[PDB]
Design a protein around this motif. Structure first.
Motif, PDB file in Angstrom:
ATOM      1  N   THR A 219       0.822  -1.207   0.000  1.00  0.00           N
ATOM      2  CA  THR A 219       0.000   0.000   0.000  1.00  0.00           C
ATOM      3  C   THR A 219       0.858   1.259   0.000  1.00  0.00           C
ATOM      4  OG1 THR A 219      -1.900  -1.060   1.050  1.00  0.00           O
ATOM      5  CG2 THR A 219      -1.667   1.315   1.322  1.00  0.00           C
ATOM      6  N   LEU A 220       1.883   1.308   0.854  1.00  0.00           N
ATOM      7  CA  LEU A 220       2.743   2.483   0.899  1.00  0.00           C
ATOM      8  C   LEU A 220       3.501   2.660  -0.409  1.00  0.00           C
ATOM      9  CD1 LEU A 220       4.124   2.638   4.537  1.00  0.00           C
ATOM     10  CD2 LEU A 220       2.559   4.192   3.368  1.00  0.00           C
ATOM     11  N   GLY A 221       3.914   1.557  -1.037  1.00  0.00           N
ATOM     12  CA  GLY A 221       4.561   1.658  -2.330  1.00  0.00           C
ATOM     13  C   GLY A 221       3.646   2.229  -3.392  1.00  0.00           C
ATOM     14  N   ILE A 222       2.411   1.727  -3.470  1.00  0.00           N
ATOM     15  CA  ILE A 222       1.475   2.249  -4.464  1.00  0.00           C
ATOM     16  C   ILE A 222       1.204   3.729  -4.222  1.00  0.00           C
ATOM     17  CG2 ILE A 222      -0.841   2.038  -5.413  1.00  0.00           C
ATOM     18  CD1 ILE A 222      -0.694  -0.953  -4.676  1.00  0.00           C
ATOM     19  N   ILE A 223       1.137   4.144  -2.956  1.00  0.00           N
ATOM     20  CA  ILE A 223       0.868   5.551  -2.664  1.00  0.00           C
ATOM     21  C   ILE A 223       2.064   6.427  -3.030  1.00  0.00           C
ATOM     22  CG2 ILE A 223       0.447   7.199  -0.816  1.00  0.00           C
ATOM     23  CD1 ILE A 223      -1.197   4.871   0.516  1.00  0.00           C
ATOM     24  N   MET A 224       3.279   5.998  -2.676  1.00  0.00           N
ATOM     25  CA  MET A 224       4.421   6.911  -2.720  1.00  0.00           C
ATOM     26  C   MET A 224       5.182   6.827  -4.038  1.00  0.00           C
ATOM     27  SD  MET A 224       4.569   9.054  -0.519  1.00  0.00           S
ATOM     28  CE  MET A 224       6.080   9.835   0.036  1.00  0.00           C
ATOM     29  N   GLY A 225       5.407   5.616  -4.549  1.00  0.00           N
ATOM     30  CA  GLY A 225       6.197   5.469  -5.757  1.00  0.00           C
ATOM     31  C   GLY A 225       5.559   6.134  -6.959  1.00  0.00           C
ATOM     32  N   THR A 226       4.230   6.077  -7.056  1.00  0.00           N
ATOM     33  CA  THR A 226       3.546   6.751  -8.154  1.00  0.00           C
ATOM     34  C   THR A 226       3.798   8.253  -8.119  1.00  0.00           C
ATOM     35  OG1 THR A 226       1.841   5.082  -7.780  1.00  0.00           O
ATOM     36  CG2 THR A 226       1.395   6.769  -9.431  1.00  0.00           C
ATOM     37  N   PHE A 227       3.580   8.878  -6.961  1.00  0.00           N
ATOM     38  CA  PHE A 227       3.803  10.312  -6.831  1.00  0.00           C
ATOM     39  C   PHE A 227       5.245  10.679  -7.154  1.00  0.00           C
ATOM     40  CE2 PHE A 227       5.067  13.794  -3.883  1.00  0.00           C
ATOM     41  CZ  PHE A 227       4.398  14.818  -4.512  1.00  0.00           C
ATOM     42  N   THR A 228       6.203   9.940  -6.590  1.00  0.00           N
ATOM     43  CA  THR A 228       7.607  10.282  -6.792  1.00  0.00           C
ATOM     44  C   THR A 228       8.032  10.079  -8.242  1.00  0.00           C
ATOM     45  OG1 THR A 228       7.905   9.453  -4.545  1.00  0.00           O
ATOM     46  CG2 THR A 228       9.873  10.071  -5.769  1.00  0.00           C
ATOM     47  N   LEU A 229       7.673   8.947  -8.845  1.00  0.00           N
ATOM     48  CA  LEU A 229       8.086   8.670 -10.213  1.00  0.00           C
ATOM     49  C   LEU A 229       7.326   9.508 -11.232  1.00  0.00           C
ATOM     50  N   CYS A 230       6.210  10.127 -10.842  1.00  0.00           N
ATOM     51  CA  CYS A 230       5.516  10.989 -11.790  1.00  0.00           C
ATOM     52  C   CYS A 230       5.966  12.442 -11.685  1.00  0.00           C
ATOM     53  CB  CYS A 230       4.004  10.884 -11.603  1.00  0.00           C
ATOM     54  SG  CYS A 230       3.303   9.294 -12.095  1.00  0.00           S
ATOM     55  N   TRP A 231       6.257  12.936 -10.480  1.00  0.00           N
ATOM     56  CA  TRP A 231       6.538  14.358 -10.339  1.00  0.00           C
ATOM     57  C   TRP A 231       7.977  14.702  -9.982  1.00  0.00           C
ATOM     58  CZ3 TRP A 231       4.508  17.999 -12.682  1.00  0.00           C
ATOM     59  CH2 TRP A 231       3.129  18.124 -12.868  1.00  0.00           C
ATOM     60  N   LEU A 232       8.751  13.774  -9.421  1.00  0.00           N
ATOM     61  CA  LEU A 232      10.137  14.087  -9.077  1.00  0.00           C
ATOM     62  C   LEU A 232      11.008  14.404 -10.287  1.00  0.00           C
ATOM     63  CD1 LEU A 232      12.355  14.261  -6.860  1.00  0.00           C
ATOM     64  CD2 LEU A 232      12.833  11.873  -7.384  1.00  0.00           C
ATOM     65  N   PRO A 233      10.996  13.628 -11.380  1.00  0.00           N
ATOM     66  CA  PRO A 233      11.904  13.947 -12.493  1.00  0.00           C
ATOM     67  C   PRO A 233      11.701  15.332 -13.079  1.00  0.00           C
ATOM     68  CG  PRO A 233      11.064  11.738 -12.729  1.00  0.00           C
ATOM     69  CD  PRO A 233      10.268  12.372 -11.636  1.00  0.00           C
ATOM     70  N   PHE A 234      10.471  15.846 -13.082  1.00  0.00           N
ATOM     71  CA  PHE A 234      10.222  17.146 -13.698  1.00  0.00           C
ATOM     72  C   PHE A 234      10.846  18.283 -12.899  1.00  0.00           C
ATOM     73  CE2 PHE A 234       7.503  20.944 -13.670  1.00  0.00           C
ATOM     74  CZ  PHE A 234       7.755  21.390 -14.943  1.00  0.00           C
ATOM     75  N   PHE A 235      10.724  18.253 -11.573  1.00  0.00           N
ATOM     76  CA  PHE A 235      11.138  19.413 -10.795  1.00  0.00           C
ATOM     77  C   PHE A 235      12.654  19.527 -10.704  1.00  0.00           C
ATOM     78  CE2 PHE A 235       7.556  21.676  -8.889  1.00  0.00           C
ATOM     79  CZ  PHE A 235       6.518  20.919  -9.380  1.00  0.00           C
ATOM     80  N   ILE A 236      13.375  18.410 -10.818  1.00  0.00           N
ATOM     81  CA  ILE A 236      14.834  18.480 -10.840  1.00  0.00           C
ATOM     82  C   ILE A 236      15.313  19.221 -12.082  1.00  0.00           C
ATOM     83  CG2 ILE A 236      16.957  17.167 -10.646  1.00  0.00           C
ATOM     84  CD1 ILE A 236      15.480  14.953  -9.344  1.00  0.00           C
ATOM     85  N   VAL A 237      14.750  18.894 -13.248  1.00  0.00           N
ATOM     86  CA  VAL A 237      15.144  19.621 -14.452  1.00  0.00           C
ATOM     87  C   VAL A 237      14.602  21.045 -14.423  1.00  0.00           C
ATOM     88  CG1 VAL A 237      15.205  17.433 -15.687  1.00  0.00           C
ATOM     89  CG2 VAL A 237      13.219  18.930 -15.938  1.00  0.00           C
ATOM     90  N   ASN A 238      13.466  21.270 -13.758  1.00  0.00           N
ATOM     91  CA  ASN A 238      12.966  22.632 -13.587  1.00  0.00           C
ATOM     92  C   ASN A 238      13.953  23.485 -12.801  1.00  0.00           C
ATOM     93  OD1 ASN A 238      11.327  24.855 -13.666  1.00  0.00           O
ATOM     94  ND2 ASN A 238       9.666  23.981 -12.443  1.00  0.00           N
ATOM     95  N   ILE A 239      14.573  22.907 -11.772  1.00  0.00           N
ATOM     96  CA  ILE A 239      15.609  23.626 -11.035  1.00  0.00           C
ATOM     97  C   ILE A 239      16.865  23.786 -11.886  1.00  0.00           C
ATOM     98  CG2 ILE A 239      17.126  23.520  -9.034  1.00  0.00           C
ATOM     99  CD1 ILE A 239      14.382  24.360  -8.301  1.00  0.00           C
TER     100      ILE A 239
END
Ligand SMILES: CN[C@@H]1CCc2c(ccc(O)c2O)[C@H]1O
Length: 285
Positions: A219-239
Motif C-alpha cells: 500500500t505504501l509503495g502504491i501511494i508513494m512510488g507513483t507520486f515520486t516517479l511521476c513528479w520528481l523527475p520534472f522538478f529536478i530539471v525545472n531547477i
C-alpha cells in the motif's frame, strides 16, 4: 506520416480518461449519503483539481504541440499558464493534507474526533486553495516571472508564440512551495505510520502466535512510488535548466511536464478502492 495523427489519438484518450474518472468520483460522492465523510472532502477537492486540469490545460496544450502555434491571443497564453500552475500546486498540496489526515488517525486515535470536524476541514481546504491561487495567478499576471535575455523578449513580443521562460527566483520559489515541502511532510508521516503498523503486527503475533492465524509495504509503495516517479523527475530539471542553460533541451522539458500531467488520471485508482466506492460505482452504472 503517422506523427500528425499518432499523438492525437493518445492525447484524446488521456483527456477522456481524466475527465471520466473524476466525473464519476464526484458524482458517486454527491449522489450517495454514506460516502459523505470528513476524509472524503479532501478527495473531493483533489478530484476537482484533476477535473479542471484535464478539462482546461491538456486540450489546449495538445493543440499547441500538434499545430506548433498559438492561434489565440497573448492574454490567453498567460491565463493558461496561470491555470496550469494553480492546478498542479493545488493537487499536490491536497495530497499532502490527505497524508497528514491519515497520520493523525493512527497516531492519536482517542483525540482524532475533536481534532478534525466538518468546520475545520472546510477552512483547511479553503486555505490550501488560496495559497495555490496566490503563488500561481498573482506573480504571473503582473509579469514578475518574465526573463531578461533576448530570446524571452522576442517570445513575449510575438502574439503567435506561447513558450515558458522564467527567472531564477521564481523557479526556485515555485518548486519549493509546490513540491519539496509536501514531499518531506509525506515522507515523515508515512514512515511513522509504517512503524506503528509494524508494532501492531508484532503485538498480534506475540499473543496469537500458536495458531497460524507485506500489505503495508504494498500500500505504501502504491501511494508513494507513483507520486515520486511521476513528479520528481520534472522538478529536478525545472531547477537545473535555469542554472545551466545549454544542458536541458526543450523537448525533454515538455516530455517530463506531460508525464507529470498523467498523474491526474491515476488518483481514483489509488484513493477510491474501498468497497463502499465499489458498491456506489456498481449502482451508478
Ligand atoms: C507550463 N508548465 C509549468 C512551468 C513551471 C511550473 C509548473 C508546475 C508547477 C510549478 O510550481 C511550476 O513552477 C509547470 O506546469
Amino acid at each position: 506520416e503517422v506523427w500528425v495523427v499518432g499523438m492525437g489519438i493518445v492525447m484524446s484518450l488521456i483527456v477522456l480518461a481524466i475527465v471520466f474518472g473524476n466525473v464519476l468520483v464526484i458524482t458517486a460522492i454527491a449522489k450517495f449519503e454514506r460516502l459523505q465523510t470528513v476524509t472524503n472532502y479532501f478527495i473531493t477537492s483533489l478530484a476537482c483539481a484533476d477535473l479542471v486540469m484535464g478539462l482546461a490545460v491538456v486540450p489546449f496544450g495538445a493543440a499547441h504541440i500538434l499545430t506548433k502555434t498559438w492561434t489565440f491571443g497573448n492574454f490567453w497564453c498567460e491565463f493558461w499558464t496561470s491555470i496550469d500552475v494553480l492546478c498542479v500546486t493545488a493537487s499536490i498540496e491536497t495530497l499532502c493534507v490527505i497524508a497528514v489526515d491519515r497520520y493523525f488517525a493512527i497516531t492519536s486515535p482517542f483525540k482524532y474526533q475533536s481534532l478534525l470536524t466538518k468546520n475545520k476541514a472546510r477552512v483547511i481546504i479553503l486555505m490550501v486553495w488560496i495559497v495555490s491561487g496566490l503563488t500561481s495567478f498573482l506573480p504571473i499576471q503582473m509579469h514578475w516571472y518574465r526573463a531578461t535575455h533576448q530570446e524571452a523578449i522576442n517570445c513575449y513580443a510575438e502574439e503567435t508564440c506561447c513558450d515558458f521562460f522564467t527567472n531564477q527566483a521564481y523557479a526556485i520559489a515555485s518548486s519549493i512551495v509546490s513540491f519539496y515541502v509536501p514531499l518531506v511532510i509525506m515522507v515523515f508521516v508515512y514512515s511513522r505510520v509504517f512503524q506503528e503498523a509494524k508494532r501492531q503486527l508484532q503485538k498480534i503475533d506475540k499473543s496469537e502466535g500458536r495458531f497460524h492465524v507485506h500489505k503495508a509495504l504494498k500500500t505504501l509503495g502504491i501511494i508513494m512510488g507513483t507520486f515520486t516517479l511521476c513528479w520528481l523527475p520534472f522538478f529536478i530539471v525545472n531547477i537545473v535548466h535555469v542554472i545551466q542553460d545549454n544542458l536541458i533541451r526543450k523537448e525533454v522539458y515538455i516530455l517530463l511536464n506531460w508525464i507529470g500531467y498523467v498523474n491526474s488520471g491515476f488518483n481514483p485508482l489509488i484513493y477510491c478502492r474501498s468497497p463502499d466506492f465499489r458498491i456506489a460505482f456498481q449502482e451508478l452504472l
